[PDB]
Write a protein that binds this ligand. Structure first.
Ligand SMILES: [Mg+2]
Ligand SMILES: [Mg+2]
Ligand SMILES: [Mg+2]
Ligand SMILES: [Mg+2]
Ligand SMILES: [Mg+2]
Ligand SMILES: [Mg+2]
Ligand SMILES: [Mg+2]
Ligand SMILES: [Mg+2]
Ligand SMILES: [Mg+2]
Ligand SMILES: [Mg+2]
Ligand SMILES: [Mg+2]
Ligand SMILES: [Mg+2]
Ligand SMILES: [Mg+2]
Ligand SMILES: [Mg+2]
Ligand SMILES: [Mg+2]
Ligand SMILES: [Mg+2]
Ligand SMILES: [Mg+2]
Ligand SMILES: [Mg+2]
Ligand SMILES: [Mg+2]
Ligand SMILES: [Mg+2]
Ligand SMILES: [Mg+2]
Ligand SMILES: [Mg+2]
Ligand SMILES: [Zn+2]
Lengths: 174, 141, 38, 59, 206
RNA sequence: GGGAAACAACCCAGACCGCCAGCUAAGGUCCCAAAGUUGUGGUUAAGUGGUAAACGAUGUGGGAAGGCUUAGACAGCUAG
RNA sequence: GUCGGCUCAUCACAUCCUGGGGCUGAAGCCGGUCCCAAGGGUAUGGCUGUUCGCCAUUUAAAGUGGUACGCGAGCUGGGUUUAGAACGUCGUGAGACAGUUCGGUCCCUAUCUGCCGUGGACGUUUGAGAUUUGAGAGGGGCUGCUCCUAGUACGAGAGGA
RNA sequence: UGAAAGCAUCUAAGCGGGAAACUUGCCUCAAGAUGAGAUCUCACUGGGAACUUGAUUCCCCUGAAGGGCCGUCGAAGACU
C-alpha cells in the first residue's frame, strides 16, 4: 500500500485530540472527527501522521490506505477548504444564492430552491457559475452532486449543470 | 423399574440469559435444551422437567454472515397469494422478541409437551424483566 | 447498458469492475460500452 | 433414555457421555447403562464416584 | 375528536345560484364527556362521551356508577374518540361547534341491513342466461373453484351471505351548514344507515 | 430390521421366542432426535454447502517459471 | 364426461398499459432495444360451433402462460361418437368415409374436507354492566382528455416538450 | 468520499438519491392474540357437621350485581 506508507504532512495550525480510535483534527476553518477503523495503526509522533496495519489480512491493508486518504482530506479540509465549481449552460439558466438557499432556474415550471446543509456555503459570482465551499470533501462532493442532479448535461447542446472540469460528451442528430 | 419424573414433583429453576452479542442459533440451542430438561438426570421424554428461561436484550442478538438482511421469515395467512416475508433486520426492529422465539420454537418438539416447554420461555426487549420475584439466576452460556 | 452473459473490454477505455458481486464493464469514452453480469 | 440421563448426570460432573463411556472401559467398569442411569438420578454420590473413576482413567 | 349524532333524514339546500345540494341532516345533541383516557393510565389517549338519554330502569348499577363518577346523565350509548394533545374533563359538552361550515368530515354509521344477499346483489356477479336453455341456474354463482388442483375453495371466495348492517365510513363530506341553536349538522351527500341511526362525525382523515 | 426426510428393486443386514444386558454395520453425534458445540492443520464468504452448460470475470489459496527493474521497473504528473 | 361458450376464478412473469431507469443510427414529438417492476388495469361487434383468424370500430392497453388444454354432483349443448334420412365416393353386397348434410333424453335432496354467512358451549381463575389497545388479517391501489406552464425548451421548417 | 491497485473505481470501511412492487398511511374485522390483554364502575362481609383434613364434601339460611325466559316490537333478521 503506497498510500498508507505515505505519511500525511501536518501543516502549521492543526491540532489533534487523538483518543483511542476517535481521531479529531481542527484548523482555521473548522473541526472534524474521524472514528478510525479498529484495525488501523494511527499514532502521532510529531507534526506529522503515519498509518500502518495491525494485521496484514487484506481488508486491513485497504483500510489503512483509505484511512490515510480520509485523514489527509481532513487535514487539507480544516486548513484550506474544499471547493467544487459548477457551470450552467443553456439560455435562461440562472443560479442565485441567498444565504443557505440556492435558487436555480433550469427551464422548469417550478422554482428550484436547494437548501444547503450546515458547513456548506454557495456563491454565484456569475448567474451561470456556482461555487460550493466547505471543509468536508465528502459533503462538498455530495452537495455538488445533488445540484448537478437537477439537470445533468445533455449531449446535444451541453445544457445543464456540469462540473468545471467535467468532459461533457457531445453528439448531434444524424 | 426405571425412574420416571412425576409432573407433580418436578423442581424447576428460573434462569436469565442475556442475548446481547449472542449468535441466535447457538443461544437458541442452549435455551431449547434447558427448556426440555435435557440437562437434568431426571429427564423424561413425556414430562416437562425443564427450567424457566428469561431472555433479556433480545434485539441485541446477532447473526453471522449476511443473514441480517438475507434471513427471511415467511408466513401464510390462508388467503390466496397470502405469502408474507420479513427480514431478520426488519423483524428485529419491529418484534425483536419474535426472532429468538422463532428460533427456539423450531427447536422444540411440535406437540402439546413442546408447546408446554415453550410457555416457560420469556423473551424481553429491554435489559429488565418483570419476573424479579422469581429471582432468576444469571445463566451465561 | 448491455446485459449479457459474456462481458469484456470492447476498447482500451473499458474497465472491468466488480460491484456487489456483479462483473461490470464501464467505459469513460463510450457509454455504449457499459456492460453488466459477466 | 438411560444414555440421555447418563449424559445429563455426567455433564453435571464435567464429562460428556462419550468420554465417560470411554473412561469406564479404560478402567474396567462393567456397570451397564440401566444401573448407571438409576445411580445418576437416585444415588448421585455413587454416580459422582464412578465419574471420577472414569476421569482418572482417561488421564 | 368527533361527535355522536343521529341521522335525521335527507333534504336539499338551494343556493342563490339555484344549485340544489343534497344534504343529510344529523342532529348532534350535546355530547357529555364521561371519562378522559390518558397514556399514564390506559396506554393511550382517548375521550369517552355519551349522548342522549336512558331511563333509569334500563341503566345497570355499574353503568350508573360510571356515569355518576363523571357527574353526567346516562345516555343511550357510550363512545370513544382517539385523541392527540387534547385535554378534556369529565362533564364537558362537546357540541356541534367543533365543526365549521365548509370543512371536510368523515361520517361513520351502521349501513342498512339487507339480510342474506345473493351474489348478484352482494358482489355484483353477472346473471347467467335467462333463456337459451339455462335450466334452474339463472342467478346462481356458477363455478366456485377449479379442480383437483387445488381441490378446494380459496379463503375469501365471494359467496352469498349477509349484506349490510356493518360499520361503514363515508369520507370527505362537506359541511354545508352548522346550526348550533338547533344542534344540527348538514353534510352534503349521503351517510350510512337509516333515519334514527347513530352516526359519528369526525374531521376527515384525508 | 437399521440408513437414505418420506421412498418394493439403493446401502447395511437376512427376524425361532423372551430380556428395562453388552458390542458393532451402513449411517451418524448443535436442537427437533441417541451419540464430539471433540482435537490438530488448512480452504470458503458464496448460506457456496443446500440443483445445471458453453462461455465471462483484477474473488481468493497454493506451486513452478519468465520479462523489466536503485545503469531508476509499473502507474501517476509535466513537456516535446 | 369431450371441444367451444356462459358464470366464477386463482397463480406465474418470459410485462400489453400505467411506474422507475441504461444505451440509441435518442434534436423535439414519436420510437427501437435492454434492465427493474406483477399494485391495479387490460374491448364491443360482423362471419364462423369454433379456440383461432380476418374484418369494422374503439382503447392507456386490448399481455403470454399454468390451474384435469381451471370450472357440466355450476349452466349450455352449437361442435364432437349412438340409433333416422340424404349427397359425393368406395364396395357385387351387407355396409363404409378420420367427406358432407338435415334431426336427435345432459340425473343426483351435500355426509366429510373446503368456502360464504350465522349461532350454541366452554374457557380467559369471584362474578358482572360498559368502553377499549391492537398481535394479526382482509379490502382498496386503474386511467384518459383539456387547459396553464408555453407555442417556451428543441427544431431549417414542419412540428413540438 | 475512498483505498486494495501512488492512477482509476458507487464498495471493500463509511455517507446518499431512487418505482404503481414491499412496510405503513386510508377502510373494515380483530384478545379462542389459550400469549385468552387494558380501563371505568357495580355486587356479594352466614352458621353447623363429617370424612378418605383444605382449591374437600354435605345440611340449613341466603339468591346480590346481573343475565335469561316471557311479552310489545324493529329501517335487525332464514332460525338465531
Ligand atoms: Mg418427530
Ligand atoms: Mg445497490
Ligand atoms: Mg334489514
Ligand atoms: Mg351477460
Ligand atoms: Mg332440453
Ligand atoms: Mg331438465
Ligand atoms: Mg328456468
Ligand atoms: Mg391438499
Ligand atoms: Mg429399509
Ligand atoms: Mg424411517
Ligand atoms: Mg442429543
Ligand atoms: Mg469445535
Ligand atoms: Mg444452494
Ligand atoms: Mg513512467
Ligand atoms: Mg421481469
Ligand atoms: Mg396481471
Ligand atoms: Mg403499496
Ligand atoms: Mg369477434
Ligand atoms: Mg345480424
Ligand atoms: Mg379444461
Ligand atoms: Mg366438476
Ligand atoms: Mg345438471
Ligand atoms: Zn470502451
Amino acid at each position: 500500500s503506497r498510500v498508507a506508507k505515505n505519511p500525511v504532512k501536518l501543516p502549521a495550525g492543526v491540532e489533534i485530540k487523538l483518543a483511542g480510535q476517535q481521531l479529531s483534527i481542527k484548523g482555521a476553518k473548522g473541526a472534524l472527527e474521524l472514528k478510525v477503523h479498529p484495525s488501523v495503526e494511527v499514532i502521532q509522533d510529531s507534526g506529522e501522521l503515519r498509518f500502518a496495519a495491525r494485521n496484514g489480512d487484506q481488508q486491513t491493508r485497504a483500510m489503512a490506505g483509505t484511512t490515510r486518504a480520509l485523514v489527509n482530506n481532513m487535514v487539507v479540509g480544516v486548513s484550506q477548504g474544499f471547493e467544487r465549481k459548477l457551470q450552467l449552460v443553456g439560455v435562461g439558466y440562472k443560479a442565485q444564492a441567498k444565504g443557505q438557499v440556492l435558487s436555480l432556474s433550469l427551464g422548469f415550471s417550478h422554482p428550484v430552491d436547494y437548501e444547503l446543509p450546515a458547513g456548506i456555503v454557495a456563491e454565484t459570482p456569475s448567474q451561470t457559475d456556482i461555487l460550493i465551499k466547505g471543509i468536508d470533501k465528502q459533503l462538498v462532493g455530495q452537495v455538488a452532486a445533488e445540484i448537478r442532479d437537477f439537470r445533468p448535461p445533455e449531449p446535444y447542446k451541453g445544457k445543464g449543470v456540469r462540473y468545471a472540469d467535467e468532459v461533457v460528451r457531445r453528439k448531434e442528430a444524424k | 423399574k426405571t425412574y420416571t419424573a412425576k409432573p407433580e414433583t418436578v423442581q424447576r429453576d428460573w434462569f436469565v440469559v442475556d442475548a446481547a452479542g449472542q449468535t441466535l442459533g447457538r443461544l437458541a440451542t442452549e435455551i431449547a435444551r434447558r427448556l426440555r430438561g435435557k440437562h437434568k438426570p431426571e429427564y423424561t421424554p413425556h414430562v416437562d422437567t425443564g427450567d424457566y428461561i428469561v431472555v433479556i436484550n433480545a434485539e441485541q442478538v446477532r447473526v453471522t454472515g449476511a443473514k441480517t438482511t438475507d434471513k427471511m421469515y415467511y408466513h401464510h395467512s390462508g388467503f390466496p397469494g397470502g405469502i408474507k416475508s420479513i427480514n431478520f433486520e426488519k423483524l428485529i426492529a419491529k418484534a425483536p422478541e419474535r426472532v429468538i422465539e422463532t428460533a427456539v420454537k423450531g427447536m422444540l418438539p411440535k406437540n402439546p409437551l413442546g408447546r408446554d416447554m415453550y410457555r416457560k420461555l420469556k423473551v424481553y426487549k429491554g435489559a429488565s424483566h418483570p419476573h424479579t420475584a422469581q429471582q432468576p439466576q444469571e445463566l451465561k452460556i | 447498458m448491455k446485459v449479457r452473459a459474456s462481458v469484456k473490454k470492447l476498447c482500451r477505455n473499458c474497465k472491468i469492475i466488480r460491484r456487489d458481486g456483479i462483473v461490470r464493464v464501464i467505459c469513460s469514452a463510450e457509454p455504449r460500452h457499459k456492460q453488466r453480469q459477466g | 433414555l438411560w444414555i440421555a440421563r447418563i449424559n445429563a448426570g455426567a455433564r453435571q460432573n464435567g464429562l460428556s457421555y462419550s468420554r465417560l463411556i470411554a473412561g469406564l472401559k479404560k478402567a474396567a467398569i462393567e456397570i451397564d447403562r440401566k444401573v448407571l442411569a438409576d445411580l445418576a438420578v437416585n444415588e448421585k454420590a455413587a454416580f459422582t464416584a464412578i465419574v471420577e473413576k472414569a476421569k482418572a482413567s482417561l488421564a | 375528536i368527533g361527535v355522536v349524532g343521529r341521522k335525521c333524514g335527507m333534504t336539499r339546500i338551494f343556493t342563490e345560484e339555484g344549485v340544489s345540494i343534497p344534504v343529510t341532516v344529523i342532529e348532534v345533541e350535546p355530547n357529555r364527556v364521561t371519562q378522559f383516557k390518558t397514556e399514564e393510565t390506559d396506554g393511550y389517549r382517548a375521550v369517552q362521551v355519551t349522548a342522549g338519554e336512558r331511563r333509569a330502569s334500563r341503566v345497570t348499577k355499574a353503568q350508573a356508577g360510571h356515569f355518576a363518577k363523571a357527574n353526567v346523565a346516562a345516555g343511550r350509548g357510550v363512545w370513544e374518540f382517539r385523541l392527540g394533545e387534547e385535554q378534556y374533563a369529565a362533564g364537558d359538552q362537546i357540541t356541534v361547534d367543533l365543526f365549521q361550515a365548509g370543512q371536510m368530515v368523515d361520517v361513520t354509521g351502521e349501513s342498512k341491513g339487507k339480510g342474506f344477499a345473493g351474489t348478484i346483489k352482494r358482489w355484483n356477479f353477472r346473471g347467467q342466461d335467462n333463456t337459451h336453455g339455462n335450466s334452474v341456474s339463472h342467478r346462481v354463482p356458477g363455478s366456485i373453484g377449479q379442480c383437483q388442483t387445488p381441490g378446494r375453495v380459496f379463503k375469501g371466495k365471494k359467496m352469498s351471505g349477509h349484506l349490510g348492517a356493518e360499520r361503514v365510513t363515508v369520507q370527505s363530506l362537506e359541511i354545508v351548514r352548522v346550526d348550533a341553536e338547533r344542534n344540527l349538522l348538514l353534510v352534503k351527500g349521503a351517510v350510512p344507515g337509516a333515519t334514527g341511526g347513530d352516526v359519528i362525525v369526525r374531521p376527515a382523515a384525508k
